[PDB]
A paper describes a structure:
The capsid forms a right-handed (dextro) icosahedron of a triangulation number T = 7 [h = 2, k = 1; (42, 43)], made up of 60 copies of the seven-protein asymmetric repeating unit. However, the handedness of HFTV1’s capsid is unusual, as most resolved structures of both tailed and untailed T = 7 icosahedral capsids display left-handed (levo) symmetry. The base layer of the capsid consists of gp19, the MCP. The MCP forms alternating pentamers and hexamers, which interact through asymmetric trimers. In each trimer, the MCPs adopt three distinct conformations. Lacking the first 100 amino acids, HFTV1 MCP fits the classical HK97 fold. The interior-facing surfaces of the MCP are highly negatively charged, which has been suggested to prevent the packaged DNA from sticking to the capsid, thus facilitating rapid release upon infection. The trimeric MCP interfaces are bound by trimers of gp18, the capsid stabilization protein (CSP). HFTV1 CSP binds the outer surface of each MCP trimer, thus stabilizing the capsid architecture. Each subunit in the MCP hexamer contains two intermolecular Mg2+ ions, as well as coordinating two additional Mg2+ ions in each subunit-subunit interface.
Residue numbers in the entry:
A (entry chain AO): 2 to 137
B (entry chain Au), F (entry chain At), G (entry chain As), H (entry chain Ax): 2 to 115
C (entry chain AD), E (entry chain AC): 150 to 396
D (entry chain AB): 101 to 149
The structure:
């Protein structure tokens, strides 16, 4: 996620509000605003599509094996969406480093609620409210 | 470089309602502020003869020269004319009703500099 | 630093939300500009003039011209605002409209650079040419040297530029900018209106701060050489603080 | 909720009234200058013409 | 208070009839404007600039911009008169016509608020741009810093405002006003002409009068934060004392 | 020697969407800022009568003289007309729908001086 | 006595290359610096319908009224028209391709005051 | 009251002598001082095709759109046209020779403001 002001591109501040700033290790190279899930013991990797893989969003760019900070549930976050979102849409990871709507995904429940609507490829503002892991 | 907007110079009209079977609308350039007129449109509620006159008097029509320009048949519009009249050249335009009864006549165009 | 924004309307007892200063950078890398000259011993002796002093002056001038090229090429190419005159109202109204564009993105410009053709057009402008409309006859009489020409549209400075200074890519070993510098045909850039403080000439030299002149003898061939160097880049800190005037 | 002004607006304080009352439209007064003024000795009278 | 009315024609020895002064209010409801920022202790140590002071400045500016948004949004939305230019006579004539609409409702305006596009077109107006038409060359020279710009059409104050300051409803947390601020297209409101004594900016702070900046430390996360707050409303006492200029 | 650029006219148009089977569009010169109009284009979504009227009131249509200029059949454009009307002559142009169903009408021209 | 040279208009054109078998060129007067246009020429690389529209929005096209002015067939030019549109009247012109394939459309005229 | 003498805006012409059997006169508005041209006259010494082109480039012709306006046959004059082109709209007019040999071509008109 990035912001244009003339010729200048500025990095988007992923965190709007919240204190659920939990620390992990990166299982791969991760980018600011990327959704992630537990890949190993306190290790996080990029989320795939259709749910069961979400703990938070990555707060700053990291290489593999570096300590990573997540905005968990009960954070307001700035996230890039792969489709058009309105307020009150539930969103979850698309698998593309970005979020999509629960309506578009094969999943029946989301992890964040859209507060500010956006177009495809833009920053929405979302509130994280849930975690998704392995139910089998 | 200097750029100017052109709005066209003053509209002119003469009109009469219920002019009788042998009576006329007389278009007089004295009624224009620039003193001279160009008639583009003649709208007639029945048949009319159009006549162009020069007066022997500066202020009233006292006929000196007269030409019947044309006769229009039935109700309609004639447009795109440049029938031209001036007060200082003492020219007048007469639209004469030739229907077997009363008609409405409206003539329009623009003022030209005398 | 990022643009300043607006506070949010907030409920009573509600969490204050974050929108802190976000940062980026403008990179420079200084291109080496170099000029060389060679003179034979026989020629150095026989000339009525000091040919090496002449060539040192030329080498210093050629470097100063290079600085101006790098400055004008950056200034013209990387201005974020534009006013398209479309062959019309070229002069004070074009300058005012350019200042309008910079004002709309909330910078105040203070300077303008100008092409010879633009200068020609500007002094043909009835607003400046007619003493009536100008408030003095200074333009009609003194042309570019008039105090008003450095005091129009809220600007405090006129930088009178040359026809040849911009990188057309027609000069030998210069690659070319994206634009056309001129005021003759559709899409020519004839002026730039800008904040003087928001564009940076960046000078680098290994052995001092400014132009370095080196002399060398060739005892095999009886030639003396003079070389000059400077490294220069030019960069906008805020390209939105400038507007190009387009024909 | 926890004590907030929008619940106790007329319970724990009154809303401020500004002590300056603020004028309606004022019409233009000119007649005494714009006219010859006769301070009459009678309600009914005549000026000769 | 109610408008001035007219006395009634009355018989002799007849009862004088009543039409007493009649009263109403306009209500302010000051909205909390808030702006937060957070910094890691590791960022704050490594940065060459004091990021906390810098964020304190951003918070200050951001609140101030919020006062300006609330003001301009009220001013533009709730002006009871409008002058429709229909793409014509934009300049002094539009300004005089706007004073005309206020004067018809029996108020004298003294101030005007202007969009960058309106300012641009105003300084293009031959009435201001030609020194003989203006009586001075100050507009041609100094643009908005000209004393005639602060002294047009009986007004004695010009307030130059930014394009971003009106609430479009595009900015995050802001709901949007009813109008479009601009002077680019059909229906845009580009200037407001008003009595500055008849529009009220109401500031409330619990802990003083002005903006309040509070800081906090998080020893659990090694984050230092800065928060600003101010409460503002804007309300007209006489919305008829004001007119918008429409493209 | 002095060279000036001429931008023509000031634009004038009246329009109606879905005017009923026997209803009309009234073109009023009072809507023009210069107070007189010259209509060039009449676009009609079905058959129409064009009528030129003088009013006996300075501000409202109270019919005095009336002439039906022409009737246009079908859907299309009439262009290059010069139907003229003004406020202080109290002239009006009425386009009447004759198609038997709802139609769209667009008239265009320019303003002229009064 | 004063002698002045008149340049007779400010130029306007809209054009599109390879517009598809039911797509359209929208001539929008908002693109003119004076806000109004008078289209004289329509050069068409195949058959087209010309349509004159009013919008129910001040700035975007949302159809209030629509009239098809004419249908042109084959490749050619229509010239000397006066198709008139402006922003404040919310008028747009749509040229719609009716060829069984892509065509080039070039419309030209002059700006007019709003 | 003020009275001005009106002289028409700048003459424009493009010409070629002995243009070959498939070659062309490229009439370019860049050659006009006001940047736009209105061609009234095309004098042709043999048969020609007239083509109106829009360029994809601001100052050279790289064809984006091309429409053949008309075909003229024999030697003669086409006059009273309003073939319109400007530099900022990137419009070029091409006259192509279709005779079995070389011809002379003279196009004339006037400049319009860009
Ligand atoms: K929770
Ligand atoms: Mg919270
Ligand atoms: Mg006489
Ligand atoms: Mg932001
Ligand atoms: Mg901009
Ligand atoms: Mg001198
Ligand atoms: Mg151009
Ligand atoms: Mg008495
Ligand atoms: Mg009362
Ligand atoms: Mg009112
Ligand atoms: Mg100054
Ligand atoms: Mg009237
Ligand atoms: Mg009257
Ligand atoms: Mg519009
Ligand atoms: Mg409007
Ligand atoms: Mg071009």
């Amino acid at each position: 996620a990035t912001e244009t002001q003339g010729e200048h591109t500025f990095p988007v501040e992923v965190l709007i509000s919240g204190e659920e700033l939990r620390g992990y290790t990166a299982g791969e190279a991760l980018s600011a605003g990327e959704p992630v899930y537990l890949s190993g013991d306190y290790e996080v990797s990029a989320s795939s599509a259709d749910g069961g893989e979400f703990l938070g969003v990555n707060l700053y760019d990291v290489a593999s094996g570096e300590p990573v900070a997540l905005a968990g549930d009960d954070c307001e976050v700035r996230v890039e969406v792969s489709e058009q979102v309105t307020a009150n849409d539930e969103i979850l990871p698309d698998g593309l480093g970005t979020f999509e709507t629960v309506a578009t995904s094969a999943a029946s429940a989301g992890v964040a609620i859209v507060q500010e609507g956006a177009a495809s490829g833009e920053v929405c503002e979302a509130y994280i409210f849930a975690v998704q892991g392995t139910t089998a | 470089t200097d750029t100017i907007v052109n709005v066209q110079g003053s509209f002119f009209s003469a009109s009469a309602s219920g002019v009788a079977d042998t009576e006329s609308l007389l278009i007089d350039p004295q009624d224009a502020k620039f003193g001279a007129i160009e008639i583009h449109n003649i709208a007639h509620g029945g048949s009319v003869d159009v006549e162009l006159l020069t007066s022997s008097d500066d202020t009233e029509l006292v006929e000196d020269a007269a030409v019947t320009l044309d006769s229009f048949t039935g109700e309609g519009i004639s447009q795109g004319n440049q029938i031209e009249a001036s007060d200082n050249t003492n020219t007048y335009i007469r639209i004469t009703n030739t229907s077997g009864g009363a008609i409405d006549i409206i003539a329009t165009g623009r003022e030209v500099s005398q | 630093a990022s643009d300043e924004e607006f506070a949010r309307p907030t409920g009573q007892g509600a969490e204050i939300r974050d929108d802190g200063e976000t940062y980026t950078t403008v990179a420079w890398n200084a291109t080496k500009l170099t000029e060389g000259s060679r003179v034979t011993d026989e020629m150095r002796d026989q000339a009525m003039v000091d040919l090496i002093e002449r060539n040192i002056q030329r080498v210093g001038a050629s470097l100063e011209n290079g600085i101006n090229r790098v400055f004008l090429t950056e200034l013209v190419d990387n201005a974020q605002n534009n006013h398209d005159t479309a062959g019309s109202n070229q002069g004070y109204q074009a300058l005012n409209s350019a200042v309008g564009e910079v004002d709309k993105d909330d910078f105040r410009p203070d300077t303008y650079v100008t092409h010879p053709d633009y200068r020609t057009q500007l002094f043909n402008d009835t607003n400046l040419a007619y003493a009536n409309r100008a408030g003095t006859n200074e333009v009609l009489r003194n042309r570019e040297d008039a105090p008003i020409v450095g005091d129009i549209a809220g600007l405090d400075m006129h930088a009178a530029m040359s026809s040849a200074t911009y990188d057309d890519g027609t000069d030998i070993g210069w690659s070319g900018g994206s634009e056309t510098w001129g005021f003759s045909s559709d899409g020519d850039k004839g002026a730039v209106v800008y904040d003087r403080d928001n564009i940076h000439t960046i000078l680098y030299a290994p052995n001092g701060q400014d132009v370095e002149i080196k002399d060398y003898e060739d005892p095999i061939r009886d030639i003396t050489g003079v070389n000059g160097r400077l490294h220069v880049d030019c960069q906008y800190s805020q390209g939105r603080s400038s507007a190009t005037v387009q024909y | 909720f926890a004590a907030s002004d929008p619940e106790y607006v007329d319970t724990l304080f009154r809303e401020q009234l500004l002590e300056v009352v603020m004028e309606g439209r004022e019409l233009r007064k000119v007649a005494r200058e714009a006219s010859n003024v006769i301070n009459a000795n009678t309600r009914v009278g005549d000026v000769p013409i």
